[PDB]
Amino acid sequence: PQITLWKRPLVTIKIGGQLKEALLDTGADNTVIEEMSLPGRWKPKMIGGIGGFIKVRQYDQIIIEIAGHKAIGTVLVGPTPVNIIGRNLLTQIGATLNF
């Protein structure tokens, strides 16, 4: 698709068996999802934005379906106000910014 930016670029994702809404976010290095369980190992991380930092759990090699496109990568889980698909997964579905 071609997604305009008059409104937030929200899409449906599937992660850990669950359907969620998430923001396609070119300003995010990393993918950050609201608290949920995921399988496998994790390690703690701090990530920072407007407002400061939050502590997250870093899960590696997680499969995510993003508007019908499968990708794998690292997913951070923690108290983000919104689910964010960052560049680490946008690259894998071939997303570009065009103007």
Next chain:
Amino acid sequence: PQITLWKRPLVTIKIGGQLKEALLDTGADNTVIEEMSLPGRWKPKMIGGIGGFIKVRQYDQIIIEIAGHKAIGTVLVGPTPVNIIGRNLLTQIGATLNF
């Protein structure tokens, strides 16, 4: 241009006759720049990011060049970690997300 996302989508902006670097950020509703002087009156605004809320100064109808494209619109000034170009100006330069 068609900008891929393997690296941060940083562009040159020009505001108040000065060049700065800024991040093209589809996850930002608003454009937020680091402290600088801008003409005119400002109004209060609170914006919520990953770590919580901050107060910013809202300046309307500011001339700003983005990657060589002319925009005139709202610029928020405050303690953002990076200059961010949000959807209010990404729409003005005709940007879309494509995959």
